Amino acid sequence: TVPKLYRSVIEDVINDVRDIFLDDGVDEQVLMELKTLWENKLMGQVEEEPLNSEDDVSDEEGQELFDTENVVVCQYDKIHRSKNKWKFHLKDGIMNLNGRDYIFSKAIGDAEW
Amino acid sequence: MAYQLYRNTTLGNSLQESLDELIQSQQITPQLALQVLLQFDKAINAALAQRVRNRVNFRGSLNTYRFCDNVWTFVLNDVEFREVTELIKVDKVKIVACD
Amino acid sequence: LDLAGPLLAFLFRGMFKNLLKEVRIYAQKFIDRGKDFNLELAIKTRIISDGLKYSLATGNWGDQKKAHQARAGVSQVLNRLTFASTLSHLRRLNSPIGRDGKLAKPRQLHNTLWGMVCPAETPEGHAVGLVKNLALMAYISVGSQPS
Amino acid sequence: TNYKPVANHQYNIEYERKKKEDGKRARADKQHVLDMLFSAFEKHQYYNLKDLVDITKQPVVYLKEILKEIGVQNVKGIHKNTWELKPE
Amino acid sequence: FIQMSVQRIVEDAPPIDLQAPPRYLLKFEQIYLSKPTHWERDGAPSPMMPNEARLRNLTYSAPLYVDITKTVIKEGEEQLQTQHQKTFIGKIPIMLRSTYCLLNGLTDRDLCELNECPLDPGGYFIINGSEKVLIA
Amino acid sequence: SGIVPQLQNIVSTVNLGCKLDLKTIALRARNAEYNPKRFAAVIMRIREPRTTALIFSSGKMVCTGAKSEEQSRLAARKYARVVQKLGFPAKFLDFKIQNMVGSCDVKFPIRLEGLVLTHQQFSSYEPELFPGLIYRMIKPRIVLLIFVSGKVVLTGAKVRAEIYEAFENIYPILKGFRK
Amino acid sequence: GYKFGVLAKIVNYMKTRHQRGDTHPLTLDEILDETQHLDIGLKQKQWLMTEALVNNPKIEVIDGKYAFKPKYNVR
Amino acid sequence: IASACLYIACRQEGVPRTFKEICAVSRISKKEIGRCFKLILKALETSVDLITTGDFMSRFCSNLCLPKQVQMAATHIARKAVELDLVPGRSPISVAAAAIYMASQASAEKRTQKEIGDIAGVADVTIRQSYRLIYPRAPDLFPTDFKFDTPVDKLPQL
């Protein structure tokens, strides 16, 4: 199922860029080579000024530096939180779980912070 | 000059890598690669909003969240994805949202 | 002869036009603001209630601000001195002078009043011949469509 | 059944909801605001302050300060004194 | 006037057209009259007898209602048509012993029960307790 | 009386003495959320003290959610240090508690109708707008929400002593209106 | 847009550069790179060189290059 | 300010109108009327006697076309329920609507929950909650000299 969507995306992509390739004056043969390579790659403190009285008041700061874990890209229609829990109302989006690609239209999520 | 969401993905990475390979061969100017990426982003955005009609659910624990430029960066831990047909378990996930 | 109905219908259209004008003004403010308007709040009910009441209360016809050209004396306190005076007052006819009355004198008893207006009943003084009374079997048509 | 008790009129809550969803206009950086103003200047010689606000979508006070820094207002005898996007 | 002229006046009034671009229309179709009513301090409606109007210096008036149909177009190929049935628009003073008076069709004995003279011909209005006659 | 109000919320304001770039803080801060269209400040939250702090570009910050004065200052210092770690010269100047909120139960129902009649000059009881009774204490500038269930909420106090003093004043009054 | 939305950023960017204290002049091409106007029209380059960068009272032509005019301004 | 003043004037005259009733005649929302209502009292240093359930029985019952006996029973039920403290903390309007519903259901003229809510301005859910609290003591609340078209034991349960 997922591969069929990818092929349809390719068909839309090539059609969408046909006018651009004609406009910029580049030969259409470039597009044919582009798809070939594209397919191959995929498959008492009185003085308070100093703040040093407290140390190690933060966790690891490299969580966003790596980004090697699964990443979810989506669009949000409403996100509200009531004193304990974050409720996610996210519409159509894509996900990359353990390499596998997942696509959803409507999703609902509840989380605790 | 667009939303530019799916660029940092396996699909986006492969397209960027392919464009770089052509550039190294002097087959495409850098401007053409940018135009292709912009067209690709428009095509995928329209495709997802149209050809995706499946509903899913998930639960988990939130560890970190951010919001800047109307972009959420939720970081969830121990997330269980529940679907009518399948269930998935993931230790950590980063959610990037826009609107 | 303009009886109560046609006289009242004259007031209602002026007062109804103000009502429709008022809702137009009220709605225009909200529409321009970008928000829909509430119909119940747009209607000013005092326009018809006080307009009809004011004219009957005072006898002036037209809006209160337009009293300069407002006809006076159409509405009078019913005479309850005797039953005859009550009956006569309810059958009283007025002949306004205005510009038209100047051209021809209406005080004189015209031939055509026979059977329609009493030839004897008319106030003495400045109002001789101008205030009239229906004859007993006199009838004033209420009107109907010529379709 | 007229003027029935109601906590809030339907037209009022719908308008309130729309304003909340749209939200207040934010203060964009001067460079971006300046670029938009100059780009729109080509379309027409002169702009009204109210109309210019919609195009730029910036706070009136903030927009006026930016416009004052470069733009000026010329007195026109046909309608009224209006802002001119040309600094000179 | 009550049965025909008032309805004709409302019907003959042009529809109210308003443009923002959402477009709004108001059309008034049907006119209703209730019996002469008086509202107490607490707001409780009650039929108003002509003698009570005379005694308490009230106006013998009947509530007037009009059916209003509102149609709104927002250039989105959708039309919403909402009708407000019996929209209060004012009160018409009522001529006594007329078809819309409470003393309509009442027998002479019934009139005496209401402290009304059967020989009273009607044909006038009670405006702030004063019996007002409209001179032709 | 035997009942001591429990501080439910502490609001304190501090000045970092340095203009801040809200956009930069949101992009770098772990838990900060910024939305200039919605609000002009930056909302950041922390778990261990369980407090929320609003950071303004002018350098002033407001911390809320702390259940004690010590927690509020510690939470405020944590927020100030976090901003400092982001490259700003944040300080801890003129830290002040702006409002204190306390809640307690009298362990008996209260007749609000009688209370307002006897204390009309201080009590505004409007069930349509709010079921609870709003009592505005004078000698302490404290506003108290008295409920038929017996729960009493004190707010507007600047120091803990004000909360305890206000409840002490109101308790005998409430006792007289026991249901 | 065209012929108007590009020249302004050159003036605006140049004003900010002086506030850093860099009195050194700058070339037409050099300023274009930092202003993200490398794709400016060909006839705009000559128009700016011939008219905009000389007629303006805040542009100083030095050794063929252009520098801000703090001398005219009171500092 | 005018809408809040109108509300106060009604209270000061002994014929209160609920905030929703005043809002229905004004473009100002009920929230804003309440905000100006409290400010006006502070500015004028005045006060308004607390509303009761019987302050709305005449208007509500009359607007519902209910007989006088139903109104009398409805007034008695609401006052007795408050006296017995069967509805502690409930808004007087909610109690009045529920009391009207109980009396209405016990007479020939029966009014649905929706009907009473529209005139009373109280959601049928709110009427349901208050009615459930007073339903158990129905025989005690009803006036002694009351004729039941529907016996009290057979009143609606919900």
UniProtKB/Swiss-Prot annotation, chain A:
Residues the entry annotates as binding DNA: H80, R81
Subunit structure: TFIIA is a heterodimer of the large unprocessed subunit 1 and a small subunit gamma. It was originally believed to be a heterotrimer of an alpha (p35), a beta (p19) and a gamma subunit (p12). TFIIA forms a complex with TBP.
UniProt modification remark: The alpha and beta subunits are postranslationally produced from the precursor form by TASP1. The cleavage promotes proteasomal degradation.
Disulfide bond entries: none
Residue numbers carrying Phosphoserine: S53, S58
Protein name per its UniProtKB record: Transcription initiation factor IIA subunit 1
Family, as annotated: Belongs to the TFIIA subunit 1 family.
Pfam families, A to Z: TFIIA (PF03153)
Organism field: Homo sapiens
Cell compartment(s), UniProt: Nucleus
The protein's role, per its UniProt record: TFIIA is a component of the transcription machinery of RNA polymerase II and plays an important role in transcriptional activation. TFIIA in a complex with TBP mediates transcriptional activity.
From Swiss-Prot, chain B:
Superkingdom: Eukaryota
GO CC field: cytosol; nucleoplasm; nucleus; transcription factor TFIIA complex; transcription factor TFIID complex
One GO BP: positive regulation of transcription by RNA polymerase II
Keywords assigned by UniProt, alphabetized: Host-virus interaction, Nucleus, Transcription, Transcription regulation
InterPro entries membership: TFIIA_a-hlx, TFIIA_b-brl, TFIIA_gsu, TFIIA_gsu_C, TFIIA_gsu_N
The keyword Nucleus is annotated on this UniProt entry: yes
Location, primary (coarse class): nucleus
Subcellular locations according to the entry: Nucleus
GO molecular function, one term: protein heterodimerization activity
Subunit structure: TFIIA is a heterodimer of the large unprocessed subunit 1 and a small subunit gamma. It was originally believed to be a heterotrimer of an alpha (p35), a beta (p19) and a gamma subunit (p12). Interacts with NCOA6 general coactivator. TFIIA forms a complex with TBP. Interacts with HSF1 (via transactivation domain). (Microbial infection) Interacts with SV40 Large T antigen.
Family: Belongs to the TFIIA subunit 2 family.
Protein purpose: TFIIA is a component of the transcription machinery of RNA polymerase II and plays an important role in transcriptional activation. TFIIA in a complex with TBP mediates transcriptional activity.
Name by which UniProt lists this protein: Transcription initiation factor IIA subunit 2
Species of origin: Homo sapiens (Human)
Name of the coding gene: GTF2A2
From Swiss-Prot, chain D:
UniProt entry tagged with the keyword Glycoprotein: no
Keywords assigned: Acetylation, DNA-binding, Nucleus, Phosphoprotein, Transcription, Transcription regulation
GO function terms (MF aspect): DNA binding; RNA polymerase II general transcription initiation factor activity
Any Gene Ontology biological process: positive regulation of transcription by RNA polymerase II
Compartment(s) of residence: Nucleus
Coiled coil feature spans: none
Record's GO cellular component terms: microtubule cytoskeleton; nucleoplasm; nucleus; transcription factor TFIIF complex
Origin: domain of life: Eukaryota
Residues reported to bind DNA: G77, H79
Record-annotated membrane-spanning stretches: none
Role played: TFIIF is a general transcription initiation factor that binds to RNA polymerase II and helps to recruit it to the initiation complex in collaboration with TFIIB.
Subunit annotation: Heterodimer of an alpha and a beta subunit. Interacts with HTATSF1 and GPBP1. Interacts with URI1. Interacts with GTF2B (via N-terminus); this interaction is inhibited in presence of GTF2F1.
Family classification: Belongs to the TFIIF beta subunit family.
The protein's name in its UniProt record: General transcription factor IIF subunit 2
Curated annotation (Swiss-Prot), chain F:
Sequence repeat segments: 7-83, 97-174
Tissue: Widely expressed, with levels highest in the testis and ovary.
GO terms classed as biological process: DNA-templated transcription initiation; mRNA transcription by RNA polymerase II; positive regulation of transcription initiation by RNA polymerase II; RNA polymerase II preinitiation complex assembly; spermatogenesis; transcription by RNA polymerase II; transcription by RNA polymerase III; transcription initiation at RNA polymerase II promoter
Compartments it resides in: Nucleus
Alphabetical UniProt keywords: Disease variant, DNA-binding, Host-virus interaction, Neurodegeneration, Nucleus, Repeat, Spinocerebellar ataxia, Transcription, Transcription regulation
GO cellular component: chromatin; cytosol; euchromatin; female germ cell nucleus; female pronucleus; male germ cell nucleus; male pronucleus; nucleoplasm
Binding positions for DNA per the UniProt entry: N9, R45, K60, N99, R136
Superkingdom of source: Eukaryota
Record GO terms (molecular function): aryl hydrocarbon receptor binding; core promoter sequence-specific DNA binding; DNA-binding transcription factor binding; enzyme binding; RNA polymerase I core promoter sequence-specific DNA binding; RNA polymerase II cis-regulatory region sequence-specific DNA binding; RNA polymerase II core promoter sequence-specific DNA binding; RNA polymerase II general transcription initiation factor activity
Family: Belongs to the TBP family.
Protein name: TATA-box-binding protein
Organism: Homo sapiens (Human)
Span covered, complete protein: 159 to 337 of 339
